[PDB]
């Protein structure tokens, strides 16, 4: 004491897992020291951040069952669907070239060199893909998962390297039961809401009642 008081070490309130390793040892001055490692399994879920190698980041917005995924006449079911609107405004042609190259490498059986300026030219990849029995544009006919009919357009499809970043939602989320600033105060004023400002800012247990004289203007007793 500064009887004895508890000073035990406990896991963080918003974490979970399984204890993986416990070691006991001595510090540099003879005091005992222990370290505990906790491991947690983190299957991808909504909000997890994914990014390709061409600076195209994003969080997953929906996890769709396999039977609802569209498939290809060759039997390929995509593992990831990206929006076409993200390409023109970013001008990442390297992403499309890499998709074609991954398709060619998978079909041919050897990896494809992409070493900057002395890499394999994209026209050679297109020619090889055409020779292998696929459309030279990288597009294929796909069928809709739900209706079962044939999509009207030919869809570009390929293999792209994707890396999962550590900005995962399980670490961001936290809520306080029992952040704000000046810009938010200005916004609330601009909306015209005043009682909302009083409720959100002043709250309670920091305001008091004071008797005031209406004649002179001093604090009454």
């Amino acid at each position: 004491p500064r009887e004895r008081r508890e000073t035990s070490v406990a896991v963080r309130p918003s974490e979970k897992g399984v204890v993986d390793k416990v070691i006991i040892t001595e510090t540099g001055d003879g005091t005992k020291l222990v370290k505990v490692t906790v491991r947690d399994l983190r299957i991808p879920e909504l909000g997890d951040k994914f990014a390709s190698r061409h600076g195209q980041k994003g969080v997953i917005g929906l996890i769709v069952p396999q039977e609802d995924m569209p498939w290809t006449e060759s039997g390929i079911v995509p593992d990831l669907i990206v929006n076409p609107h993200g390409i023109p405004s970013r001008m990442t042609v390297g992403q499309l070239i890499e998709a074609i190259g991954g398709k060619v490498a998978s079909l041919k059986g050897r990896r494809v060199d992409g070493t900057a300026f002395i890499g394999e030219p994209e026209e050679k990849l297109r020619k090889e893909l055409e020779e292998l029995g696929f459309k030279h544009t990288g597009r294929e006919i796909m069928y809709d998962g739900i209706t079962g009919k044939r999509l009207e357009a030919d869809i570009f499809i390929g293999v792209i390297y994707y890396q999962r970043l550590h900005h995962m939602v399980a670490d961001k989320i936290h809520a306080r039961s029992r952040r704000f600033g000046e810009m938010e105060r200005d916004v609330l004023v601009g909306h015209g809401a005043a009682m909302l400002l009083i409720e959100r800012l002043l709250e309670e247990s920091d305001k008091t009642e004071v008797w005031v004289c209406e004649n002179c203007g001093h604090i009454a007793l």
Binding site: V189, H191, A194, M195, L197, I198, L202
Partner: peptide, 17 residues
Amino acid sequence: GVIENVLIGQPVPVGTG
């Protein structure tokens, strides 16, 4: 104004105030 009323703890004299 606004800052003075906010400091006191009174409804701001704008909109619903």
